[PDB]
Design a protein that fits this description.
monomer; three-stranded mixed sheet; 9 strands; about 45% helix; about 15% strand; Probable enoyl-CoA hydratase/isomerase; Enoyl-CoA_hydra_C
């Protein structure tokens, strides 16, 4: 397994995306490995906090477009569906350390992390509409609720990109930091901070924070995914995806 690195330290499990030649574009095997690693982390009492990162330069350019073009349609039962579910239901703290591009699910997965640290010049976007597609990972619920409709519309109906500084100002990130290694070091220090607290107090607090929202979020994720799978098989999306590839 070389596209996802699973690294361990005292209490901390780090999932490092490592497909830099393709800007960490996410393949089925990467989703499968991340889901597997989250489910193992969830069961391992030695793991108290999970950190997700792509390293000092790049988080992820999003789902591999060739995966959208070939073998496209699966909802709940698929590698990406298992990843989304594993993260959504993950009961322990998850921390994202984001540099460079964070595109598509690279941004929407941050909506399911407990802390998000970004380089101030990171580049976040949800370009679904530019590819003839629709919102995913619950973003059609989460973003309008947090930001109001109009600001969420700029991101989702237009695919407007934004900086890490802007992400922190809007509260999608907890802090925007000096780009690079500083982001990951700060995220690790946040993880170490969690290690001093009562473990079940942290876990129960997170559970209570998600409990009023989780059933609706599961439903929206399902409805989004049905629509998304339908659109991926549609001519409008195939052409947009075909146009983005081979610019």
């Amino acid at each position: 397994s070389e596209l996802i690195r699973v690294e361990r330290e005292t209490g901390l499990l780090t999932l490092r995306l490592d497909r830099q030649d393709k800007k960490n574009a996410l393949t089925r095997a990467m989703y499968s490995r991340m889901a597997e690693a989250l489910l193992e982390a969830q069961a391992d009492t030695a793991v108290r906090v999970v950190l997700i990162t792509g390293g000092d330069a790049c988080f992820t350019s999003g789902n591999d477009i060739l995966d959208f073009l070939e073998q496209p349609p699966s909802l709940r039962d698929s590698p990406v569906g298992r990843f989304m579910s594993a993260l959504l239901e993950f009961p322990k703290p998850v921390i994202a350390a984001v540099n460079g591009p964070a595109v598509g699910i690279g941004t929407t997965l941050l909506l399911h992390c407990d802390l998000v640290f970004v380089g101030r010049n990171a580049r976040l976007k949800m370009p679904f509409v530019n590819l003839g597609l629709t919102p995913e990972f619950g973003s059609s619920l989460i973003l309008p609720r947090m930001l109001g409709h109009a600001k969420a519309a700029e991101l989702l109906m237009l695919g407007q990109d934004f900086s890490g500084e802007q992400a922190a100002a809007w509260g999608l990130a907890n802090a925007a930091l000096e780009d690079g290694a500083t982001v990951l070091e700060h995220a690790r220090d946040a993880a170490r901070r969690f290690l001093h607290l009562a473990p079940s107090a942290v876990v129960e607090s997170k559970r209570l924070m998600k409990a009023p929202f989780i059933e609706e979020l599961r439903r929206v994720i399902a409805e989004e995914g049905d629509i998304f799978s339908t659109r991926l098989r549609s001519p409008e999306a195939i052409e947009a995806l075909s146009a983005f590839m081979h610019r």
